[PDB]
């Protein structure tokens, strides 16, 4: 792998009009799928950190977003990051995204590290744009070789003991942080359970315990279920992403979680700011945001809003899909022996 060449060319368009491309090789996103997939594998599913560490929510394919972070919040190693995942869909440049956060946790692998997000499963990117970028530039066999990567990743994460970290939120099956490390790689995200509710699930200042999901997916959980989480557990905040905030940045319970959403002005459909936290050696919270036109600054003004292929799709569509997810997932992707029970199959 000739990942500082490959790196370098991912950084190169600095400065360029948002939206071109990075022209990698099959081969060399291959190799970063492979080697960074090992990588993942070595690694605790359940990652435990340290601070000092910058923290970002979705990025969603915003590649010309993604750049202007580091730029704003230092390029790696000049900090250390942990991103919550959701890298690609709904954005137009998911590979340059994932490509380069996969190449920056080749690169330093104890310094940056990658969360799964419920965009990071193949039922869920094969419909809202992943599958399409890799089809239309180079092939189904590389959208797959990313699946792979994906069930891989890590999904949840400790820092300094203190603050749990995941992509959506708690779990009413969640009861032991055992029950996450048990969890084998590489597997997919079910449609219910502990793995679904941890990618999936939302707080709700009007939920008192548990309520319904709007998403149809998961739950919401409420304040209460947030501070009796922290106390049995002696964790002082959670940090999640999975939700659009103003500021990029949204406390919840007493400021016990925190939401960070680091694509601004999304998808172009909402005036939000994109935030990262930064949490210092001595456990301090704060926040740099990019705004459209803590500290401030301006978010890049560039057209956001996306094509949005899958409120197209026929009841014949769908039904074709399906079967083409169900034969992938029952003929080719691996998944661990100990969670095949997890493979999200679809009603034909
Ligand atoms: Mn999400
Ligand atoms: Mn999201």
Same mark, same amino acid.
Request: with cysteine; net charge negative.
């Given at each position: 792998?000739? &990942?500082? +060449?490959?790196?370098?060319?991912?950084?190169? #368009?600095?400065?360029?009009?948002?939206?071109?491309?990075?022209?990698?090789?099959?081969?060399?996103?291959?190799?970063?799928?492979?080697?960074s997939?090992?990588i993942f594998?070595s690694q605790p599913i359940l990652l435990e950190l340290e601070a000092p560490l910058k923290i970002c929510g979705?990025? /969603?394919?915003? =590649?010309? %977003?993604?750049?202007? &972070?580091?730029?704003?919040?230092?390029?790696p190693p000049?900090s250390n990051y942990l991103f919550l995942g959701?890298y690609?869909?709904?954005?137009?440049? !998911?590979?340059?995204?994932?490509?380069?956060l996969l190449a920056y946790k080749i690169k330093y692998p104890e310094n940056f590290f990658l969360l799964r997000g419920?965009?990071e499963?193949? +039922?869920?990117?094969?419909?809202?744009?992943?599958?399409?970028?890799?089809?239309?530039? =180079?092939?189904?066999?590389?959208?797959?070789?990313?699946?792979?990567?994906?069930?891989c990743l890590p999904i949840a994460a400790i820092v300094?003991?203190?603050i749990?970290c995941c992509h959506?939120?708690?779990?009413?099956?969640?009861?032991?942080?055992?029950?996450?490390? @048990?969890?084998?790689?590489?597997?997919?995200?079910?449609?219910?359970?502990?793995?679904? %509710?941890?990618?999936?699930?939302?707080?709700?200042? $009007? #939920?008192?315990?548990?309520?319904?999901?709007?998403?149809?997916? !998961?739950?919401?959980?409420?304040?209460?279920?947030?501070?009796?989480? *922290?106390?049995? /557990?002696? *964790?002082?905040?959670?940090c @999640?992403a999975?939700?659009?905030?103003?500021?990029? =940045?949204?406390?919840?319970?007493?400021?016990?979680?925190?939401?960070?959403?680091?694509?601004?002005? =999304?998808?172009?459909?909402?005036?939000?700011?994109?935030?990262?936290?930064?949490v210092?050696?001595?456990?301090?919270?704060?926040?740099?945001? *990019?705004?459209?036109? #803590?500290? #401030?600054?301006?978010?890049?003004?560039? $057209?956001?809003?996306?094509?949005?292929?899958?409120?197209?799709?026929?009841?014949? $569509?769908?039904?074709?899909?399906?079967?083409?997810?169900?034969?992938?997932? +029952?003929?080719?992707?691996?998944?661990?022996?100990?969670?095949?029970?997890?493979?999200?199959? /679809? @009603?034909?």
């Amino acid at each position: 792998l000739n &990942l500082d +060449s490959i790196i370098g060319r991912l950084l190169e #368009v600095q400065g360029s009009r948002p939206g071109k491309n990075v022209q990698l090789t099959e081969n060399e996103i291959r190799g970063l799928c492979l080697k960074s997939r090992e990588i993942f594998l070595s690694q605790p599913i359940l990652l435990e950190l340290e601070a000092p560490l910058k923290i970002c929510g979705d990025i /969603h394919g915003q =590649y010309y %977003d993604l750049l202007r &972070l580091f730029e704003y919040g230092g390029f790696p190693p000049e900090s250390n990051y942990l991103f919550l995942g959701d890298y690609v869909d709904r954005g137009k440049q !998911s590979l340059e995204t994932i490509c380069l956060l996969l190449a920056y946790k080749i690169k330093y692998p104890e310094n940056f590290f990658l969360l799964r997000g419920n965009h990071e499963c193949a +039922s869920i990117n094969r419909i809202y744009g992943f599958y399409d970028e890799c089809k239309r530039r =180079y092939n189904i066999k590389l959208w797959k070789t990313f699946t792979d990567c994906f069930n891989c990743l890590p999904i949840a994460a400790i820092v300094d003991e203190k603050i749990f970290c995941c992509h959506g939120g708690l779990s009413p099956d969640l009861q032991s942080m055992e029950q996450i490390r @048990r969890i084998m790689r590489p597997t997919d995200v079910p449609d219910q359970g502990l793995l679904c %509710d941890l990618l999936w699930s939302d707080p709700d200042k $009007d #939920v008192q315990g548990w309520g319904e999901n709007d998403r149809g997916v !998961s739950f919401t959980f409420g304040a209460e279920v947030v501070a009796k989480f *922290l106390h049995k /557990h002696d *964790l002082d905040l959670i940090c @999640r992403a999975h939700q659009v905030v103003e500021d990029g =940045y949204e406390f919840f319970a007493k400021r016990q979680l925190v939401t960070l959403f680091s694509a601004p002005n =999304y998808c172009g459909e909402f005036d939000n700011a994109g935030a990262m936290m930064s949490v210092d050696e001595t456990l301090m919270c704060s926040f740099q945001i *990019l705004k459209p036109a #803590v500290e #401030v600054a301006d978010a890049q003004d560039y $057209d956001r809003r996306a094509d949005k292929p899958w409120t197209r799709l026929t009841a014949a $569509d769908k039904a074709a899909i399906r079967k083409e997810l169900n034969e992938f997932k +029952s003929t080719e992707m691996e998944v661990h022996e100990l969670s095949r029970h997890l493979t999200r199959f /679809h @009603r034909p």
